[PDB]
Structure formats: C-alpha cells, structure tokens
Symmetry: D2
Subunit: 459 residues, 4 copies
C-alpha cells in the first residue's frame, strides 16, 4: 500500500515551495540521472532510457483498473476522450464506435486486438492531475499526457514522430520500443506531427529495448518511434508531453510585426518611399539580373531587417506567452498546509440551520505570501494592469476562458513585490502602497480569489 511514488508525493506535501516541489518531482521522475546533466546534454538532442530496476516505481499513478472504473462511472466518449486503434499489415485504422465508451464496448475492442488510448487522463484521475500540475511549473510549458493500453500480440499505432518532448512511463506489462534518429536535418526538432510512416521509410533504430514497469523512455520531437507487445503480456504506459510550439521561432513570430510597427513609428528611414522603379529589377522574372540596383536593394532589406532587433518588445511578448501559459495551465494542487492557510481551508460551513465560523478579516498585522509561485502573472495591456491566474482553470485544456483581475496603479508595486518575494511572508501593513485601504483591499482581493495565504489561519 506504498510506492516510491506515494512517498515522493508524501514528500512534496511537506516541502513548502511550489518551485522546490516541481524541481524535486522532476529529479524523481528521471532518477538516478541528475536534472542538470539531462537538460544540458540530453534534452532535445538524445533519446534516453532509465532502467529503473523497480517494478513498483510508479504504483499509485494510474492503472488499467483505474481506466475500467472510469469507463463505468464517468462519461467517457469515443473520439473526445478515448481511442481504439489497430496497426496490422503496415496499415492503421481507428475503430471507435460513435458515442459513449462503455466497458462492454471497450473490452470487446481490447479482445479484438485494439489498443485503447485515453486522451485526457488528468481530467478523470487526481494523481495524474497532480503529477502534471507540478511538473508544468518546471517546464514553463504545459504538460499533458496520453495513456496507452495495448493488448498482447499486436501493435496499436504506426511508426511516426510527434510535435512534443515525450516522456514514456511504463506502467504495467512490457513493450518492445524502437526509436530512431531524425532521418534528415529538417526533421530534427520537427514543428508538427508526422504522417504515419511505413517500415521502408525508416533507417536503423538508435535505441531498441523492451521496456518494463518503472522504466522511463524519453525522446525529442522529431524522433520517429514505434512500439509492440510480444508474448502474451500487455502494455500499459503513460506518455507525458510538453514543449508544444515553444520555440525561438515562435518567439520571433510574435516579436516581428510589433517591431516593424515600432520601427515605422519611431524612425523615418522605415517610412521612406520605395524606389519608383524597383519593379524593374526585383521579382522572380529578374532573379538573374546583374543590375547593381538589385544588390543595393537586397543589402538594404538585410540591414533594415537586422535593425529591427532594436525595436523588438521582448518583454511584452514574454508576458503574452506567460499569459498563454497561465491560460494553458492545470489548476494548482495544494499542500495540506497551503489549503489550511488559505481561503479553501477556512472552516466556515453550514451547521444546523446557519453558517458557523465567520472567519477573522485580514488586518495590517496579517503576514502573507502568494499561495504558490506558478499560478499568477502580472501583464500590462493598453495602459492597464491585469493579473492572470490559474486557480479557476479546469482540468480540461481551455475549458475555461483566461481568467484575470485588474490591479489598479496604486497597487502595482505591492503586487510585483508579492510575486517577486515568494515564499517569504510580509506584513500587509508593510506593502508599498499609498494608503491602508489599498494595502487591505489588495490582500483581501487576492485572498478571497484563492491566490494568497496567511502565516496563521484566519480562524
């Protein structure tokens, strides 16, 4: 009734800092490999196998039993929540009947040699939720997961790459995995998922191995992979994915239109007229021209492009990606102390015909900090100040719109101070505001919204 995993979880509960929690969990996830080694040399470059030598490593995360109660007690739909898949004679085809996915239907598909894939494990299981909710804080990119249940003597899926950084957690059974290097430069760190491939289309595997429970297998986006079950045992695995559209390229995409517009507003060379007659030497039809105006034009394009770095709003865009990450974020999993010290742990309830324990209000004396570290971001838009937060997000991606509350200019400095000083308590009375009304109102607002905690329970 215990695993390394239930222990690491019990551990996370005791570490006060969300930042520290995430770092710790990631260490665990890849142990004995050190994070720092992994991130500096292996991540995005190398396929990685961690032979755990433990069969009980991930016990308490997720299991086929979990799925079977899920099909029975939760409204799981084919195509929305669960897939049914078969690769045979170099040909894959989905077999989801439309509508609800009942055990009866599901298990019949298993018995016919269809794998089952559950698209949002974190919606229906609180242990996957917590796992992902913690790890996303150290990835600075949303982490989602798919759970893959493959029957004996069969392959579910075709060889292919994905558009995310993959962590395969083997959960039950065994599977033969083949992983390859990218076939060409343009497939390295591929931007979008590949078509399903055929076996002719592949080279040699860089890594071929039989995974077993507790084992972990990681490979960057672009690394083609397949996986089969061999001798009368099955596979269960959870693959954890992150880093979707989180490239330098995606950063520039957002920076550029702004930079050109800043440059055109602020500097008259970007507002000058094109030549009257550039059409006489620019264009496909003239790509071979030896007119020297051609090479002047090119050279001016190149410097003007270069000169836009100076006008790029790197900070504003970082904030905008921060805002999208908040929106993308799973809502936080509280420690017991965190809940107990917050609005969620106030003991006010309904007891025999009335509400009992109206709590204390917060005073200048109350000491406070941000509930956690990875749940809020302050962002300027149109000369206004908004705090976006994760605490009301659903455990389905984007099920809620992005949530935020205004921060008035007078309260700005205090908010920045709060965000920047987690996890160090601070007197409400000591927040850098003009009045005492402002100090209270800020903290009250933040406390009521489930963003703040007090050193000692209000009641």
């Amino acid at each position: 009734w215990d695993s390394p995993l239930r222990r690491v979880l019990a551990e996370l509960n005791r570490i006060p800092s969300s930042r520290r929690r995430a770092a710790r969990l990631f260490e665990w996830l890849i142990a004995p490999m050190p994070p720092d080694h992994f991130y500096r040399r292996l991540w995005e470059r190398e396929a990685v196998l961690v032979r755990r030598q433990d069969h009980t490593y991930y016990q308490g995360l997720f299991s086929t039993a979990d799925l079977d109660s899920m099909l029975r007690n939760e409204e799981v739909q084919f195509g929305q929540h669960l897939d049914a898949a078969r690769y045979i004679n170099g040909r894959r085809e989905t077999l989801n009947p439309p509508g609800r996915a009942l055990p009866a239907a599901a298990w019949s598909l298993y018995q016919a040699g269809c794998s089952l894939r559950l698209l949002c494990p974190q919606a229906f299981s609180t242990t996957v939720w917590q796992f992902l909710a913690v790890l996303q804080e150290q990835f600075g990119s949303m982490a989602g997961s798919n759970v893959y249940l493959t029957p004996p003597n069969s392959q579910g899926f075709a060889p292919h790459y994905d558009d995310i950084e993959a962590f395969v957690l083997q959960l039950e059974g065994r599977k033969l995995w083949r992983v390859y290097r990218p076939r060409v430069p343009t497939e390295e760190l591929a931007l979008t998922s590949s078509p399903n491939f055929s076996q002719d289309d592949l080279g040699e595997p860089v890594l071929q191995t039989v995974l077993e429970p507790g084992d972990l297998l990681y490979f960057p986006r672009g690394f083609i992979h397949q996986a089969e079950c061999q001798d009368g045992v099955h596979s269960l695995h959870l693959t954890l994915s992150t880093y979707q559209r989180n490239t330098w390229g995606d950063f520039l995409e957002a920076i550029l239109p702004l930079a050109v517009q800043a440059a055109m507003e602020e500097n008259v060379e970007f507002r000058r007229g094109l030549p009257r007659d550039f059409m006489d030497y620019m264009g496909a039809q003239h790509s071979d021209s030896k007119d020297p105006r051609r090479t002047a034009f090119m050279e001016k394009v190149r410097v003007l492009v270069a000169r836009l770095g100076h006008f790029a709003p790197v900070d504003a865009v970082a904030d905008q990606r921060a805002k999208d990450f908040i929106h993308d974020s799973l809502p936080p999993v509280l420690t017991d102390r965190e809940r107990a010290l917050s609005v969620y742990g106030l003991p006010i309830r309904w007891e025999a015909g009335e509400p009992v324990n109206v709590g204390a209000q917060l005073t200048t004396e109350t000491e406070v900090h941000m509930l956690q570290d990875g749940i809020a971001r302050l962002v300027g838009e149109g000369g206004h100040l908004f705090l976006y937060y994760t605490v009301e997000n659903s455990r389905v991606y984007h099920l809620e719109e992005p949530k935020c509350l205004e921060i008035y200019p007078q309260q700005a400095d205090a908010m920045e101070l709060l965000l920047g000083s987690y996890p160090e308590f601070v007197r409400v009375g000591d927040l850098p505001c003009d009045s005492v009304e402002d100090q209270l109102s800020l903290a009250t607002t933040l406390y009521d919204k489930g963003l703040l905690l007090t050193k000692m329970p209000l009641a």
Copy 2:
C-alpha cells in the same frame, strides 16, 4: 483649341514607348525644373513651387464647366463622388445632403460659401484619366486625383497633412496657400492622414504664396497645408496624389512573416526550444533586472532577427507589390497607332445582316510586342505562373477584381522575353518555345486579350 497641355498630349501620341511617354509628361508637369534634380533632392524632402508664368498651361485638362456638365449628365452622388464643405471661424462643416448632386443643389451650396470636392475626376473625365494613367507608369504607385472648387472669400477645409505625395495644379482663379514643414520627427513622411488642426497648432509656413493658373505646388506627405480664396475670385485646382503606403516599412511588413517561416523550416536554431525559465527574468516586471540571462536572451533575439535577412523572399514580395499595383492601376490609354495595331483596332463589324472584315490569324511571320510597358506583370504563386494585366480595369478604383491568365511553364521564357524587350518587335517564330504551336498559342492568347500589338494590322 490649343494649349501647352494639348500640345504635350499630341506629342505623347507620337512617342512610341509608354515608358518614354510617362517620363516626358512628368517632365512637362514640372517644367522647367529637371526630373532628375527633383527626384534626387526635392521628392520626399521639400515643398516646391513652380511659377509657370503661363496661365494657359493646363487648359483642356479640367474646368469648372466640365464639372457643371458632369453634374447634369452623369449620376454624381454626394458622399460617394462629391463633398461640399466650409471652414469658418475655426470649424470644419460638411453639408452633403444625401443622394444625387444635381446642378441646382451643388450651385446653391457654392453660393452659400461651400467648397466642392470631386473625388474621382478620372471616372468622369477622359483627359484626367489619361493624365494619371500615363503618370502612374513612372511613379510605380497609383496616381489619384481630387478636384477642388472654392468660391470667392472662403476656406473649404481646415489645415491638415495628407498621407500622400501631393501635386497641386492650379487651373482657374487664385488661392493663397500656406505650407508648413513637418512639425516633429514623427510627422515627417507621416503614415496616416492628420486630423483637422486649429491655427494654434501651426508654426510658420515655409511657403506662402498665391497660386495662379498654370502653376504647380508639390509637398510631401506630412507637410501641413491650408488654402483660401482672398478677394473676388474663385479657385479650381486638381491635386494629383501618389505614394500611399509605399514605404520600405511596408515592404518589410510583408517580408518578415515569410522570412521567419522559411528560417524555421530551414534551420534548427529557430526550431530550438525556449529556455524553461525565461519567464523568471523577461517581462515588464523585470525591466531593470541585473540577471545575466536577460542580456543573453536579448542578445540572441538581436542575432536571430538579423539572420532573417538571409531568408527573406525579396523577389516574391516585389512581385506581390507589382500585382497590387496592376490591380490599383487605371486601364491604359492607347495611342492611335497602338489601337490600330491591336485587337481593339480590328475592322471586324456587323454590316447589313452579317459580320464583315473577319480578320486574319497571326502567323509565325507576324511581328509583335507588348501593347504597352505598364499593363502586365508575371507573378509566381503556389507553383504556377500567372500574367496579371490592367487592360480590363475600370476607371473606378477596384471596381474590378484582379485579373489574370495562366502562363504554362513551356510558355514562361517567351513571356519573359516579350515583357523585357518592349518595344522591340519579335517574330512569333522567333519566340523561345518548344514548338511552333506553342509560339502561335501564346501570341494568339495575348493578342486576343489586348496585351499585344502587331507591326502591321492583321487587317
């Protein structure tokens, strides 16, 4: 019956190249100032006044009498075609009753002190159309016009700047003009039109002068200007306009997103993942962060942006701007020769119950060149090659959608040759083509659309 203008038109009819006709008329427009001096020093830099000392210079172009017949014989509409406005006691009013602009309404508005503005003189005047259609060819930019009639002792419009390069042709009467240099760096070569300014907002004119018929005033976008009729005499002028959104910045706007897209598809530095914690040091909150990872991130942006220049498809963007110019352009004005030697000049008509003078096909002995030099442009899009042309455009702006015909790859070299050797004749049989048929095919196709003239009439 004769004027400097009617002589220069007659002269244009005898100059065989449309390139040369355009150069000549601009030379005429600014005479005696040299075009190369003007474009090298004054264009985009400085207001310019040309005291013609010839009050007949522009006769035949446009007169108030034309305006009057126009109101009576065409469907001229307030708002769409004609504004009537009054500047008094520092306010700008607009008095456009809705609907038709009859002579009776228009002339009473004028009698109450209203200035009348014709928005598209070139829709109702063949002499204005021809003027602009020739000039657009040596501007590389659409040339617009507006005609302004002001009654004695009034100002129609409040001071402002325009977003276009303006040439003011004083046609009747006299007007006192004031033109000011740009007030501040950001209004030099301004991007968009000004609001109505008050006289408290102005500095000192750089030029204040009373224009008389025949004179010319030019001032760049961003130069504020205002005008009034002074004692006992009205004014008519035509302002010729061009260079709307035709700047280096506009070219960059289109280039950038293509460039970033090509860099991501072609180079993995762009495909690399952002740091997992850039949010810790980047954002409005960290403007003044000493952290060594901010300056290293900023530095990388500046170098990646610089590297986009190597990826910029400059030629394809030039073709896209050329295609928009073809779409923006007035349909061409043919010389007597160009008409006679083209499809428009074919003698074929209906005569006494049937068609007669049914003409000869072209042969491989037929000698050809493009009908004019500013009527067509070859553009590549999505693997295919298209010839966009102006000969079916309307004298109303964008009343027609962009027009083209497909050029197959076999025919591309011949097409490129024809565009590039205007106005030298080429035997159809001497065209780069893989077959005689291919030779005939392209020539026939271009002749029928009115894109081609033969050395001798087909009939």
Copy 3:
C-alpha cells in the same frame, strides 16, 4: 427613319399622365388585340401569337447594329452581360471565355454557330430602358429583358420553361418557335425555372410558327418553348419578362408569420398550452391511429389557422411589396414637359466664372403635382413614415439600395393627397398642413429630390 415604334414614343411624350402612357404602350405592344380581352382571358392562361403584318413595327427599339456598337464602346463582359451558347446533338454548351466581350471574340463565336444573349439591354440602350420603364408601370411588377441573337442554321438553347411571363418581340430575321402547354398540373404557372429538357420529354406543341419582324409571341411561365433558325437567315429578338415571384402564395408567405405573431399577442386561445401528451397520438408513427384525440387535435389546428385571417396585416404587406417594387423599378423616363417643369429642367448653370440663372424658390402660389405616378410610395415602418422613390435608381437591377426620405407625421396628409391626386395640380398654399411653413417645406423637399413638377417653370 419613322416607324410605328418611333411614333408611339413620340405620342407617349405628348400624353401628360404616366399612368396613361403605360396603358397606351401596352395597347400598342399587343395591337390590334385589346388589353382588356388579353388580361381577362389570355394572361397566365394561353400562348398568344400576334402576326403583325408590318416588318417595321419595332424598328428603333434594338438592332444587331446596336449590339455591335455596344460591344465596341461599352465594357461588355462575358458572363456578367453576355452569354454565348450552343445547342447541338441534344446538348446545351456555354462557351463564355472569361473577361471582356470584344467584337472580335463575339463575332467569331457567332461565326462558329453560337447565339449571343445580352442580359441587361436596358443598361446600354435608352430606347429599351424607356420601353421597360414605361411598361413596368402597368404590370405592377418589374419588367426585365434579354436580347437573343441567333446565327443561321442553329439553335442556341435547349427547350425549357422560364419562371416569368414572356413577351417575345421578333426584331430581325426569322425563327421557328415551338411552344407547349404545361405538361402537368404542377408545372402550370411554375414557380422556378426548369432544367434543360430533351425532346423525349416533350409533348406536342400547342403553337409552332415562324416569327417575322414585328410579330409578338406571349406565353406564361411553365409553358415550355424552343426556337431555331432555319434557311440561311439569322434571328434577333427581345424577350420582355415580368411577374417573377408575384403570386398570392408569395403574399401569404409574408402575411402568415405576422398574423400568427399578432394572434398570439392579442388572443389567449393561441397562447394556451399544447396537450401534455399529444406525442402519444400525433406523429408519423400514428398516421393510421384511431385515437379520437388525434382528430380533435387536427380539428383544432384547422380552426386556428382559419382564425388567423382576422389578424393578417394585409395593408402593411401590400406596402412592403410596393417598396420592393420601388427598389426593383427602372428610373423614370421623363417627357420633355416633365423635364422642363422639374428640377432637372432648371436652367442654372456655370457660365464664364460664375453660376447664372439662379431660379426662384417655390412659393405658396406655385402649382404642383407629382413628377409621375409610379416613382413613389408612402410606407409605414416601425411607427415612422417613409417615402420610397425610384428617381435615383440605376438602369442596373439593385445596383442602388432602396431610397427614401422621412415624411413627418404633420406632413402625412399632404403627402397622401399629392400621391393620390396626380395629375391634378395643387397650389402649395392648398396643401393639408398645419402651417404655411409646413406646406412650403414639404413641397421644396419633394421638388429638390426630383419628385415634383410645377405648372410653370420656376425659371
């Protein structure tokens, strides 16, 4: 140079009432057959042939020569303006090259046996305009036209029926026409155009005849018809069309949803709750049920539909249809008298630097009547009162948007009087308004818009 057509138009210009003009021209159009006989017994009932015995009857209306000038001097396009079609071996081919329809393209198509179909003759021909604009006034419905030119020894089009009442006016040459009664009850007075039919689909013609210039052929919507040119001569005809979607059913479609909505607002029977269990006895599955609640339900539906007649806003729907007709209508063709006595005839012009002949205002002594009888209609919408008018419409269908001016409540009676008493003159001072100022101002507005004429010119 004189023809029965040119005489009847010269006659129309001397008939002071537009109502009378419209009735006169229809009498002419079907002479010697009396209109009252035609509309009582033949209209919507029978195909009618009128052998004119006068090849000159229509001379002046439209000729193939007019088509030729129109291809050359107007921007006539294929598709938009002009179809080129061929019917052979039982198959309708359209051969419209895209773009301009120059004479050379069009006549070669005609020489390859294509007929040409001009879609909006009234846009390019003032005499067809006049013809249609006059006739619409006695149809109560838009009068459209197409011109069909067919070469010798060919058929342009497959047999078919159209959705309009058709009048075929043979202009040149000869054509062998066949017209068929409705093949079936459901095709009598058909609602929409037919597909192209083969000859296997056709019964026996009710009329088969060779038309010669001056003849007329009429047949109702749903009568199939086809036509070929036979021994070495061409044909040119003009088909006049009208009564598109102008039925009692069309009137009902609009009446019903207003009637139901008023019944529900004004009477509680319509508001009561359906029977809690009607689904047990009503539905396809209970077609042949015997439950006596099914037949009680059916009888309640029959009585409630019946009762909706009492709530039908018949007059309002009449006005909406009239407003649609105002929008649909061609702009009016003024007699010389009407032009002289209106705002269009006003002699104010620009002359040598100045307007001249500034004419008097209306006074309460001016006598006035509406410019014509079918240029305006007063329509109540949403508590306000609007006068919709046709004088600013274009000769292209719906090229302008419906046009009205607000008629304030105080002016209603005067407006109604004017509309209802054309063509009797009324002194402005005799109009039913509350003030003299109100009398002058209604009249001035109408006059200025071109809706009114004065017994004597204002100048």
Copy 4:
C-alpha cells in the same frame, strides 16, 4: 433515514414501467389532490396551495446542507451556477463577484442579506436529477428547476411573473408568499418573463400564505408573485418548472410556412399572379378606401389562409417537437432491474491482468424490450429514418448535441413495433424484418447503445 420522499422513490424502483413511474410521482407530488382533477381545471387557470400537514414530505430531495457541500466540492461559479440577489427599498440588485463561488464568499453574501439561487441543482444532485427525469416523462415538456435560499428578514427578488408553469416545493424554514391573478387579458398565459415590477404595479393578492416544509404552491405563467422571509427564520425551496414555449401558437409557427409552401406546390390558385394593380387600393394610405376591390382582396386573403389547414403537415411538426424534447430531456434514471437487464448491468470488467465475464451475444431466442418508454423517438428527415435518444444526455441543458442513430428501412417496422409495445417482451426472432441478420443487428445495436433490455441478463 426515511421520508415520504424516499419511500416514493423506493416505491418507484419496483414499478416496472417508466410511464407508470412518472404518473405515480406526479400523484405523490400533489398528494392528496388527484392529477386528473388538477390537469382538467387547475393547470393553467388557477393558483393552488397544497397544505401538507407533514414537515418531512420532501426530506431527501435537497437541503441547505447539500448546497454547502456543493460549493465546497464542486466548481460552482457565480453567474453560470449561482446568483446572489437582494430586494430592498423597491429595487432588485445582482451582487455576483466574478468567478468561483466558495462558502466564504457565498455565506457572507448570505449574511450581508442576499438570497442564493442555484440555477441547475440537477447537475450537482442525483435526487433532484431523478425527480425531474421522472416528472418530465409526464409533462411532455422539459422539467427544470431552481433552488432558492433566502436569509431571515430579507426578500431576494422583486415581484415578477415567469414564462413557465411553476411548482414551489417548500423544503426548510418558512416563506410568506403572495400570488396574483393575471392583471389583464394579454398577461394571461404570458409568453415571456415580465420585467421586475414595483408594489404599485401590483393588485391585491388572490393567494397569500406562509409556506411550510412539505407544502407545494402552484401557479401558471403570467401569475405575478413575490415572497419574503419575515421575523426569525430562513427559506429553502425548489421550484419545478415546465411548459416553456409549448403553446398552440408555437405549434402553428412551425406548421404555417410549410403549409403555404405545400399549398403553392400542390395547387395552382396559390401560384396565381397578384392583381397588377393591388397597390392602387391596398396599403395603409388606402385603409379608408371604399374601393370594392379592396374588400375582395381581404376576403380572398381570408379564404386562402383558412385553406392552409388542409396542407398543414401536423405529424411532421409533432415529430420535430418530439425531437426537440428528446434533446431537452434529462437522461433517464434506471431502476435496479433495468440496470441489471441492460448493457449497464453487464458484469464484464478488468480482473487482475485481463478482461473477464464476457457476456453472451444475443440470439433469436432472447426476449427484448425498450429500456424505458420516454427515452427515444423515431423521426423522418429526407426519406431517412433516425432514432433520436436521451440516454447519453448530460444533466446540463443542451450541453450535448441531439443524439441519434439511423434505422434502416428493413428494420423500420421492427423498431416501430418495439416503441409501440412497451413494457412487454418480444422475441428477437419474432421482429418484423425480412431476414434474421436484420433482426439481430437491430436488437444488438439497440442493446449496446443502452436502449434495449433483455428478459434475463445475457450473463
């Protein structure tokens, strides 16, 4: 652990027929008054107070304790889920802070003086879900409910009337209600919710009582009502609501456009052209006319409308409303026996390592019937046969699309049979199909979708 409510549910769980269950529960709901009396003279006419003399009638349904838990354990939002309302000094006020509804916020709004309205108790409560699911089966119309919780000495909501038939169940505390007869003819059986009224707009009540636990207070749409908590005690009630837009009027709205369309296709008088001159005597300007042609037009509009009943597709519209109802319907509550005899009862599951308890397929000897009576409906669209069902609906209104499966016509008569013949069993081998493959495939299909039960479990 017992109440009249749990007994009637326990009673309900032994009644084999869903129809009978629904009838039974409604009887219990208004006990001791007979349904047959209520529906025949009370429903839609009268206010109705059922004094229960039994404070424990509804115990088990919903309590303020259930609310508290829900705030605490479910993601309940202000606006979407909960409302916080205060009626004071004659003004309604909404006091919802954006976002989540936590006990803290909720109970302080309670103690400030706000009522708390829960807009979808059936989403969070299984008992209320069962209640309504059962009742809707005997309303033929969606049953939905709101729970209102008002603190002592306040009023939450101003006087108003509603667009539904209301059943107020008093659950806790006591409220003094006032109900009113409709104020005027047009308010009787009102179509849309009234505005908030003042105590001026009101009349003198028709009913005025202090409600008490176990009581019920019914009244029809249009009936005004307000309700306060006087000295010393709170209120908790659940109002059940139905008959939103289920009127004769609404039936006719859907019937008519199709009636006219059918009439125009099937009968030529509905397709005959309007008079050419109706505009001369029809329209608001002629509402006074004495033209006898007008009275003929009116009389003709009237008969044509009355004639539309013959063409009304009454059955098709019944089926469409039936389809809308299946879409609006709560998913069913199975009995223990229904569960056991269906696909949901199958004992199939994931034992330690494998699936086990694979049920038997069905055979021609299996005895089948519809899972319940109010869960499916056969509808014809475009000669296609679709069986719309409710078994996958959510407990949130229209959260899902209308769900269905296609009945092929070989199965048609068999499907019809089952629907018509519940709750009595039928051999699969006796179903009216051509072949045995059809017999089986229909029953299988219906079984796996949760639509069909077997006499004995398949395992």
